Amino acid sequence: PSALTQPPSASGSLGQSVTISCTGTSSNVGGYNYVSWYQQHAGKAPKVIIYEVNKRPSGVPDRFSGSKSGNTASLTVSGLQAEDEADYYCSSYEGSDNFVFGTGTKVTVLGQPKANPTVTLFPPSSEELQANKATLVCLISDFYPGAVTVAWKADGSPVKAGVETTKPSKQSNNKYAASSYLSLTPEQWKSHRSYSCQVTHEGSTVEKTVAPTECS
Amino acid sequence: PSALTQPPSASGSLGQSVTISCTGTSSNVGGYNYVSWYQQHAGKAPKVIIYEVNKRPSGVPDRFSGSKSGNTASLTVSGLQAEDEADYYCSSYEGSDNFVFGTGTKVTVLGQPKANPTVTLFPPSSEELQANKATLVCLISDFYPGAVTVAWKADGSPVKAGVETTKPSKQSNNKYAASSYLSLTPEQWKSHRSYSCQVTHEGSTVEKTVAPTECS
């Protein structure tokens, strides 16, 4: 194979603390003291938090600290934050210039406060209306947990043609941001009296409306 | 870290040669010659495929070869295989406590025709400004492969803070859609001349600007 063993998952609670194991052999983890850990957020480059077993680089916080016993290396993340929620990989030297990587470890931070979303309807731009198009956008942001459902309505009558909805995605503050768009003709933008973007998060429903009347 | 810039998406069909670039910003980059390449299949851990610019680690075939220009490093996959599909990162320097990783290139084996994105930038609506809110939206649509890089500039200067970008979500027509929003103050919004959203995708770069208007 050549892969270090790490628990598939490890939950904690804000202000709580975690400990992720990483087990190798006497050839790799047990052989040298070149055990480093990687923090990778869904969709980003990996970031080195630990290197050389228990050495924290430039900027890594202090609630990240690692240690090694025999064949297993471990990383303690205390006073869990919201942003510690990522995938954590461990890796070890194994000679001949080579590196072996651990399976990943996904750490989930429990008890994060709920936040209903902030919806934002944007009528078609002048610019795009000038090219003969009209797409309306529904920006749904700062919501937690991360699951919404959106619906469109032209004049309180429902719309299923040509609506495209994005999957939530964590922001700089571990809240989600999704966006639904509805594309149409400069001609339909105009014929309806209203278009609203309806959004349900955790049972509360927020619904915004935009009219082909504005000055914007 | 002195950022390592990597194109967003890189593609071809089976049998073609795909080169990825890696351009440092500093004194060679992150600072010099110890640039390695990692391949991250989907959902698994990183893997070292090239180290010390063009050395191959062993269990690593011949089709991967590495080189370095001045400030630019290049990985080349020749006669692309289905299994070559994954994310690809560059990294620079062990020497220290700061090991910077590149931005990641996403190798795709063309499952359909390539589609440069459709960028649509929207100014903050009349309502939302009437609310002391100011939010720009930049809709990116119908692109394939599904990886793009978004930059924002306020009066030619790149906007640092307040930008959130989504994750390319498959649409119903099988192409992707993404979006970033800049969060401002009627204050900030109104103070600049023009605001720009630039999106890169596979050697195609679009850029759209909006200017504060008013009415009132």
The answer to whether A101 contacts B51, with C-beta atoms less than 8 Å apart, is no
In the numeric block, the tokens 């307040």 are attached to B162
- Determine the Cα angle at A108 with ends A107 and A109, to 5°: 120
Verify that A150 and A77 share a domain, yes or no: no
CA distance A191 to A188: 5
Nearest CB to A89 within list B45, B121, B171: B45
Q: Is B26 helix (H, G, I), strand (E, B) or coil?
A: coil
Verify that B134 and B144 share a domain, yes or no: yes
DSSP symbol at B189: H
- Cβ pairs A/B, distance under 8 A: 125
Last residue of a domain, one of A111, A126, A159: A111
CA distance A178 to A158: 20
Verify that A10 and A41 share a domain, yes or no: yes
Which residues are A17's β-sheet partners? Answer: A78
Last residue of a domain, one of B64, B96, B111: B111
Whether residue B98 lies within 8 A of chain A, CB to CB, comes out as yes
Whether residue A3 lies within 8 A of chain B, CB to CB, comes out as yes
Closest CA to B181 of A196, A216, A139, A183: A139
Verify that B100 and B64 share a domain, yes or no: yes
Query: Which of B100, B121, B125, B152 best probes binding to A when mutated, by most A CB atoms within 10 angstroms?
Result: B125
Whether residue A174 lies within 8 A of chain B, CB to CB, comes out as no
Residues in chain B closer than 8 A to A95 (CB atoms): none
Closest CA to A170 of A44, A64, A80: A44
Verify that A118 and A204 share a domain, yes or no: yes
Domains held by chain A: number: 2
- Residue A163: which CATH number? 2.60.40.10
Going through B25-162 in order, the beta strands assigned E by DSSP cover 35-40, 47-50, 64-68, 72-77, 86-92, 100-101, 105-109, 118-122, 134-143, 149-154, 157-158
Verify that A9 and A81 share a domain, yes or no: yes
Verify that B49 and B20 share a domain, yes or no: yes
Verify that B100 and B45 share a domain, yes or no: yes
CA distance B36 to A98: 11
The answer to whether A122 contacts B126, with C-beta atoms less than 8 Å apart, is no
CA distance A60 to A86: 15
- Domain range spanning residue B27? 1-111
CA distance A119 to A121: 7
Contact of B23 with B5, CB cutoff 8 Å: yes
Contact of A112 with A144, CB cutoff 8 Å: yes
Residue B132 Cα, gap to closest chain A Cα (Å): 13
CA distance A151 to B42: 31
Verify that A106 and A116 share a domain, yes or no: no
CA distance B53 to B186: 49
Alpha-carbon radius of gyration of chain A = 24
Verify that A72 and A98 share a domain, yes or no: yes
DSSP A65-111: EEEE-SSEEEEEEES--STT-EEEEEEEE-STT-EEEE--EEEPEES
CA distance B207 to B204: 10
Verify that A91 and A161 share a domain, yes or no: no
Verify that B136 and B204 share a domain, yes or no: yes
Residues of chain A by 3-state class (helix, strand, coil), percent to 5: 5, 50, 45
Whether residue B132 lies within 8 A of chain A, CB to CB, comes out as no
Last residue of a domain, one of A65, A93, A111: A111
